[PDB]
C-alpha cells in the first residue's frame, strides 16, 4: 500500500494521492506542484479499469455511479440506456496503477457492502 504515486490528468502531469481517515475516501490528483487539483470520492464510484502490462497504453480509468433503472427509449421504442462516466489517469509504471487500484478497489468494496 502506497496510496500516492504519479499520475497525469487532462495532459497536465501531476501526482496522485488517496484520501482515507477522512469523510468518504477520495482519490485526489494534484499537479506536479499542486496548483491544479481533481478529486474522486469513491463512495460515488462503482468500477475501476487500468491498462494491462501487455497494453501499449499507460492509463487508469475510474467508473462513476449511474442509475441504470431510468432506461430510456427512442422514437421507435429502441432501448437507449444512459452510461456511467469514467475518469482516466495516465501513468509511467504498472506497479503504481495496480497499487492505487488495489487501495481504491478496497475502498469501493466498503461502500459496496454499505454497513
Amino acid at each position: 500500500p502506497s496510496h500516492s504515486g504519479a499520475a497525469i490528468f487532462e495532459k497536465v502531469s501531476g501526482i496522485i494521492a488517496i484520501n482515507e481517515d477522512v469523510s468518504p475516501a477520495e482519490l485526489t490528483w494534484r499537479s506536479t506542484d499542486g496548483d491544479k487539483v481533481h478529486t474522486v470520492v469513491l463512495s460515488t464510484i462503482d468500477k475501476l479499469q487500468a491498462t494491462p502490462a501487455s497494453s501499449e497504453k499507460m492509463m487508469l480509468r475510474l467508473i462513476g455511479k449511474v442509475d441504470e433503472s431510468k432506461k430510456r427509449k427512442d422514437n421507435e421504442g429502441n432501448e437507449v440506456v444512459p452510461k456511467p462516466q469514467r475518469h482516466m489517469f495516465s501513468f509511467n509504471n504498472r506497479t503504481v496503477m495496480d497499487n492505487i487500484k488495489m487501495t481504491l478497489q478496497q475502498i469501493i468494496s466498503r461502500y459496496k457492502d454499505a454497513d
Binding site: 491498462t51 494491462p52 501487455s54 497504453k57 492509463m59 482516466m88
Partner: protein
C-alpha cells in the same frame, strides 16, 4: 529518426476519451480477428 511535437486540438480535450473508451474494452479482453 527525428523527434517531433504531437498535436491534438481538433476539438478540445474531452473528445479523445470518448473514442479511447472503445480502446479500453479491447485491452482487458484482447481478441484477434
Amino acid at each position: 529518426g527525428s523527434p517531433g511535437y504531437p498535436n491534438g486540438l481538433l476539438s478540445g480535450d474531452e473528445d479523445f476519451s470518448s473514442i479511447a473508451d472503445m480502446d479500453f474494452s479491447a485491452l482487458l479482453s484482447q481478441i484477434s480477428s
